[PDB]
Amino acid sequence: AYTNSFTRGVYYPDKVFRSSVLHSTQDLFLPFFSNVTWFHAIHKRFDNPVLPFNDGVYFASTEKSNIIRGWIFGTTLDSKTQSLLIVNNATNVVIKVCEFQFCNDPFLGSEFRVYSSANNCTFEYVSKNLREFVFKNIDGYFKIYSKHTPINLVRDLPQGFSALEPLVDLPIGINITRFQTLLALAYYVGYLQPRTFLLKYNENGTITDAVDCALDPLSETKCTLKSFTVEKGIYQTSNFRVQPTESIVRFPNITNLCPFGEVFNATRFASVYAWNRKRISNCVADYSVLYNSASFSTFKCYGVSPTKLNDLCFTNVYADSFVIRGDEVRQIAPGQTGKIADYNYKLPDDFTGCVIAWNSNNL
Amino acid sequence: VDCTMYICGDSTECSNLLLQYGSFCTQLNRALTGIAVEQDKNTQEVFAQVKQIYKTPPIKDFGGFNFSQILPDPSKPSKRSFIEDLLFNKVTLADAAARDLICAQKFNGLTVLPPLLTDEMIAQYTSALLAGTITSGWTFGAGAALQIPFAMQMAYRFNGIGVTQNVLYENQKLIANQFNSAIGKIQDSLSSTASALGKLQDVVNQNAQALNTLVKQLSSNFGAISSVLNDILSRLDKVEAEVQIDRLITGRLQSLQTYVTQQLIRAAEIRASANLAATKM
Amino acid sequence: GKIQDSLSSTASALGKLQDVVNQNAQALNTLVKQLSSNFGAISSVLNDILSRLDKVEAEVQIDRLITGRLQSLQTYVTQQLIRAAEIRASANLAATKMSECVLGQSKRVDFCGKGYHLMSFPQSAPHGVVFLHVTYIPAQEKNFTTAPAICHDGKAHFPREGVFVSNGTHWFVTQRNFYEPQIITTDNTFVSGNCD
Amino acid sequence: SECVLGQSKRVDFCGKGYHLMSFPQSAPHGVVFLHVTYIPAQEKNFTTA
Amino acid sequence: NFNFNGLTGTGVLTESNKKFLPFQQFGRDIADTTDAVRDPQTLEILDITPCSFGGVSVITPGTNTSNQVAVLYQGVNCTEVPVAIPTWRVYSTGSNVFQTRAGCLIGAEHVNNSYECDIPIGAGICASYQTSQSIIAYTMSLGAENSVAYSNNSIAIPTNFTISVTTEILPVSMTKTS
Amino acid sequence: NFNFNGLTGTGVLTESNKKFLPFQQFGRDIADTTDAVRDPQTLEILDIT
Ligand SMILES: *[C@@H]1O[C@H](CO[C@@H]2O[C@@H](C)[C@@H](O)[C@@H](O)[C@@H]2O)[C@@H](O[C@@H]2O[C@H](CO)[C@@H](O)[C@H](O)[C@H]2NC(C)=O)[C@H](O)[C@H]1NC(C)=O
Ligand SMILES: *[C@@H]1O[C@H](CO)[C@@H](O[C@@H]2O[C@H](CO)[C@@H](O)[C@H](O)[C@H]2NC(C)=O)[C@H](O)[C@H]1NC(C)=O
Ligand SMILES: *[C@@H]1O[C@H](CO)[C@@H](O[C@@H]2O[C@H](CO)[C@@H](O)[C@H](O)[C@H]2NC(C)=O)[C@H](O)[C@H]1NC(C)=O
Ligand SMILES: *[C@@H]1O[C@H](CO)[C@@H](O[C@@H]2O[C@H](CO)[C@@H](O)[C@H](O)[C@H]2NC(C)=O)[C@H](O)[C@H]1NC(C)=O
Ligand SMILES: *[C@@H]1O[C@H](CO)[C@@H](O[C@@H]2O[C@H](CO)[C@@H](O)[C@H](O)[C@H]2NC(C)=O)[C@H](O)[C@H]1NC(C)=O
Ligand SMILES: *[C@@H]1O[C@H](CO)[C@@H](O[C@@H]2O[C@H](CO)[C@@H](O)[C@H](O)[C@H]2NC(C)=O)[C@H](O)[C@H]1NC(C)=O
Ligand SMILES: *[C@@H]1O[C@H](CO)[C@@H](O[C@@H]2O[C@H](CO)[C@@H](O)[C@H](O)[C@H]2NC(C)=O)[C@H](O)[C@H]1NC(C)=O
Ligand SMILES: *[C@@H]1O[C@H](CO)[C@@H](O[C@@H]2O[C@H](CO)[C@@H](O)[C@H](O)[C@H]2NC(C)=O)[C@H](O)[C@H]1NC(C)=O
Ligand SMILES: *[C@@H]1O[C@H](CO)[C@@H](O[C@@H]2O[C@H](CO)[C@@H](O)[C@H](O)[C@H]2NC(C)=O)[C@H](O)[C@H]1NC(C)=O
Ligand SMILES: *[C@@H]1O[C@H](CO)[C@@H](O)[C@H](O)[C@H]1NC(C)=O
Ligand SMILES: *[C@@H]1O[C@H](CO)[C@@H](O)[C@H](O)[C@H]1NC(C)=O
Ligand SMILES: *[C@@H]1O[C@H](CO)[C@@H](O)[C@H](O)[C@H]1NC(C)=O
Ligand SMILES: *[C@@H]1O[C@H](CO)[C@@H](O)[C@H](O)[C@H]1NC(C)=O
Ligand SMILES: *[C@@H]1O[C@H](CO)[C@@H](O)[C@H](O)[C@H]1NC(C)=O
Ligand SMILES: *[C@@H]1O[C@H](CO)[C@@H](O)[C@H](O)[C@H]1NC(C)=O
């Protein structure tokens, strides 16, 4: 089942007091009038399976008997990784981050049947109705916002505006990609997206209104004018710009593999005063084989990234090889000087190649 | 000119860096927007000085004065006068290659907005002003168009210069013949040489020169390993690409700041010319 | 009375003065907000850098802020110098209208409002001046037959001032800008030449 | 054009008082106008109707 | 997106009429963008022009009056607007689409009446919120059209007058920042 | 000079009437520039004038 998020899910983006002002912020928000999923848990739809977490979750409950009691968050949910438990028991809110082996169908009831075991626990804390929440993992923390509000309704998420205040800021490093609700023997889930919001702060510094700057052209005018009221006119809000339908790749259709093997694994190298040069051309290369070889003590590229080197084409390539002292490798760079750089092998100031060197004391 | 689309083209990577310079691109877009709206205001205050679109009568007995070169030509879709065609041609023989260049150069985020009033509308206002004058004297300026015979309008004009009006009426045929010949010399002069209209063709050449400079500034390196920003994105990983891109951003942004500053100054020069043209009207 | 009522009611009349306030306040706010821009430094709060980095690295980050903040002042002052030139032009115009419309009566058409100028009264406004241009507008025109001259006794008579008009049976002379007919008379006409 | 080549009725354009005539004088990077003007003086009161 | 021999960009690859000489590989724009390219496998020549773009200018009455708006996609043809932009496809699917010379106008009702220019658009087009209200778009009327009734012996003379008072406003100063 | 929770600068600390919300630690002017701070021990609000 589904329903519409009537401007719900705004939250105070940072711990800074502001008043009598309109402020633009870019953050993960629930887009206005989003298509949110609706669930009918009661002590009827009891199954209430695991859900993805994505970039972050908005959660709300319409309730009368405190049936909804918490959530678990994690990836594998099977003790092969750490996971986060949040639960509100009859006397305390409890938060723990352990390698939980959760039950196949976690519930409360006199009963607590959430997990079979917990180990390697690295964080713990112990502390008619609409209850609203937002959950984020960001910048090395797990962050939670909430508000509770009185209602009188039989079904569906109510209208009107209410900004969620920050609740807790857990310094926990775990990965999260899925979550599931914990229930005691209706709720709504929405997903956050990166959005630009204009927030209206009253004289007491509460957020009393917001504009989702992307929602529609009028909202974008409001946002680009930094004003909730817009006078009659024509306003140059934005750029229309057609996105690419697909990506076309057209490299040359040459099948001949480049003979890099015979320059790196040669039996005898040339004397540096008479450094050898081999032209590499009319062939297809695979620089990833060289870079990932891990056999080289030094691998320095100038004007070309080693990883992107495999995603590029060249008109010609020249492989130069020679042997020098380990202390002389530092001279094989653009703009260098010394007996080797001055009298044996000089690189140009604007060199565009790569320098690769390895210890050969075995040969 | 869109500041972000000029500086970064398609690149999202460059666009994210350009946000760290903050407001500069919003200032440049907004300054050019002001200049653009100024041009309609300049046109409005020169030509929309007449409240009503006055018409000449079909029976054009103006006492021997022959305005046929300067009154609208009904045979044409734009319905310019004959002299307004000679004017329109000699400047559009420049431009009004630059448009075609700018259209080719549009790939770099240039755009040219149409004016609010078309050539047809401006010629419709000059028609109303001219038809008002010859039929009603200065009176259509001060208020309602009070018709008066043109021979007697011209006799008022003579009193204004301190020549008694009988000098008009006793020499009206000579005075009309002199006028008709002088209008002929105007027609010949504009048909003969474009060089009279140099003031209009110069502002066209200056705006064309400013954009062709602004386009060529994309070809600069500003010290970056390539002028073509897509090369860097194809060739360096982010930690090194950012240093190269930031050189292009800096130099391309200073190219816009120079252009927008000089166009703000030219906008004041043209507005001073428009204020004069409005006062002459 | 209509001036008082209009200024009491419409918002758009004083647009030029409010706009000048808007543009200058907007420029200041924009100049302040450019202090929050990083220009590639690790922070735009300059005290962060000097607490967080050692000197020879800090100088690299600080010089980015100095470059971008100096570029922000050059942008502000450049645009204020251009705006100052615009205000100078309005000030020279307002001074000329004080000279010619207030201290005088201007023959210049549409310079001191629509209609023929009678007089103007200056009123001060925030950062500006308001001229109440009092003007005469011809109204309720009637049509007449007219002629350049009267032929009498074989000689042509022309008006000394005004214009000849006929109501269809009688010929009169009258002033051009207000119908007050008078008998065509040797006192208000002058002769020149024969009628032919 | 207006003060030297003509007589200007434009108040306070060609100096104070009623403009009679003006003389141009050259100066470094500029021009100097000597505006000659009639200023009325020694007024007396009268009854009027 | 295209990537020829590593030369990478975005555009609408098109069969070129431009006759490259047999050795030539790229064709260049004055700004060093790629004007044309040779396919490395068929050796055919392709024109490249960029995917279209333009200013989204949003036309609105005051929010005090209405939340209706119209959108002018400046400089782009209406047949190309609906696909992409940050996305409001429900506008492009509306019944109101109208090709001005300024660009595609969406969400305004074109009418054949003419009025004074309320909101300017360009090329003689203006738009207004009018009646059941909608944003209409129309060619602006320059003024009432009048025949002066001239004749070689007719004069009009005012029998009366109006004393008019006209407010003119001029800026004189701006705030003395330092 | 002041350091509040790392917020380092110079100003005239003044007793505020601006009612921070309980979670808020700092306060800013309309310009998004620092204007007040919550003392981390007394929890009172100071105008950083
Ligand atoms: C002024 O008169 C014109 C027509 O002039 C006629 O000849 C004059 C010498 C005098 O004898 C007038 O009484 C005559 O009528 C009027 O023009 C008409 O205006 C109406 C619109 O109001 C228009 O529909 C007609 O086509 C016009 N007629 C012509 C021939 O152009 C005009 O209305 C008169 N104005 C006033 C204020 O009385
Ligand atoms: C967090 O966990 C998710 C799995 O739930 C990881 O996502 C996978 O990442 C690899 C690449 O490293 C992909 O091949 C898989 O397809 C991804 N799986 C899903 C379901 O997206 C993610 O990498 C983890 N992140 C960290 C930082 O550990
Ligand atoms: C809710 O959970 C908390 C633990 O997080 C329980 O509190 C503990 O209760 C036991 C007695 O059963 C005490 O010995 C502990 O000292 C308590 N710990 C804390 C931190 O207070 C609480 O009892 C639970 N509620 C219910 C109803 O079982
Ligand atoms: C608690 O965590 C540690 C690692 O942090 C787990 O140690 C691993 O144990 C398995 C055997 O069960 C070994 O194969 C791994 O190599 C160990 N990892 C490391 C890094 O030493 C430990 O098993 C966890 N405790 C429980 C009860 O599972
Ligand atoms: C902001 O807070 C003030 C108090 O700090 C509120 O003022 C009170 O408002 C109620 C009515 O709701 C009055 O009965 C009180 O007398 C007011 N107190 C004072 C000291 O004036 C004000 O309503 C709040 N406003 C908002 C928008 O939150
Ligand atoms: C008014 O001037 C026009 C020219 O603009 C005259 O029209 C020309 O008349 C001659 C015949 O005498 C033709 O050979 C030309 O082709 C006409 N030119 C145009 C453009 O029509 C017109 O005859 C003049 N009328 C009066 C009364 O002087
Ligand atoms: C004033 O000058 C005009 C010329 O501008 C004279 O008019 C010419 O007179 C001769 C006859 O003497 C004619 O052949 C020409 O065709 C006339 N020219 C025009 C344009 O009509 C006029 O005669 C002069 N009058 C006096 C008193 O000197
Ligand atoms: C034109 O004006 C003359 C005035 O000079 C009018 O003559 C008067 O006409 C009325 C009758 O309508 C007589 O009672 C007066 O005695 C006449 N006065 C004179 C001096 O003759 C004349 O009627 C007017 N004609 C029109 C058509 O308006
Ligand atoms: C707007 O786009 C349409 C096509 O999407 C153009 O219409 C076509 O124009 C060509 C000539 O260029 C004709 O051969 C086709 O028959 C037209 N097709 C249709 C369906 O009308 C239209 O000309 C474009 N207009 C502008 C101003 O760019
Ligand atoms: C919400 O989206 C789902 C698909 O993700 C769709 O099945 C459902 O119909 C949408 N909601 C409504 C009310 O249509
Ligand atoms: C050199 O030989 C080793 C195997 O002995 C091989 O792994 C390596 O790829 C060869 N070098 C190159 C450049 O391929
Ligand atoms: C690539 O294949 C085409 C046929 O699809 C062939 O004509 C062409 O010669 C090939 N490329 C080269 C470099 O030979
Ligand atoms: C809004 O409209 C009302 C009239 O309905 C008017 O009184 C009010 O001043 C208007 N406000 C604005 C900001 O236009
Ligand atoms: C507008 O006028 C044209 C003719 O100029 C006509 O073809 C068209 O149907 C009219 N449209 C409407 C909506 O009346
Ligand atoms: C810090 O000290 C103040 C007294 O100066 C006291 O009121 C406050 O409670 C203390 N902080 C905590 C966390 O107890």
Numbering used by the authors:
A (entry chain B): 27 to 69, 77 to 142, 155 to 172, 187 to 244, 264 to 441
B (entry chain C): 736 to 831, 845 to 1029
C (entry chain B): 932 to 1127
D (entry chain A): 1030 to 1078
E (entry chain B): 540 to 624, 631 to 676, 689 to 735
F (entry chain A): 540 to 588
List passages from the publication reporting this PDB structure.
S glycoprotein trimers protrude out from the viral membrane and are the major proteins on the viral surface, making it the main target for vaccine design. Sequential cleavage of S at the S1/S2 site followed by the S2’ site within the S2 domain exposes the fusion peptide (FP), which mediates host-viral membrane fusion, allowing entry of the viral genome into the host cell. Overall, the S-trimer structures are similar to those previously determined for B.1 in situ, and are similar across all variants.
In the B.1 S trimer, upon opening of the RBD in chain A to make the receptor binding site accessible, we observe an outwards movement (~5.7 Å) in the 570 hairpin. The directly neighboring residues 852–855 from chain B are in the β-strand conformation seen in the closed Alpha, but K854 has not rotated and continues to face the 630 loop. Instead, residue F855, which packs against the outside of P589 in the closed B.1 and the inside of P589 in the closed Alpha, rotates towards chain A residues 568–572. On the opposite side of the trimer, chain A residues 855–858 have also transitioned to the β-strand conformation, F855 packs against the inner surface of P589, and the adjacent K854 rotates towards the 570 hairpin. This is very similar to the conformation seen in the closed Alpha, but whereas in the closed Alpha K854 appears to interact with the variant A570D, at this position in the open B.1, the 570 hairpin from chain C is still in its closed position and K854 appears to interact with D568. The end of the FPPR of chain B remains in the helical conformation seen in the closed state, while the 630 loop of chain A, adjacent to 852–855 from chain B, is largely unfolded. In contrast, the 630 loop of chain C, adjacent to 852–855 from chain A, is folded. We can only speculate as to the functional relevance of these transitions, but suggest that the proximity of K854 and D568 at a position opposite the raised RBD may both stabilize the folding of the 630 loop and modulate the position of the 570 hairpin, either hindering opening of the chain C RBD or favoring it.
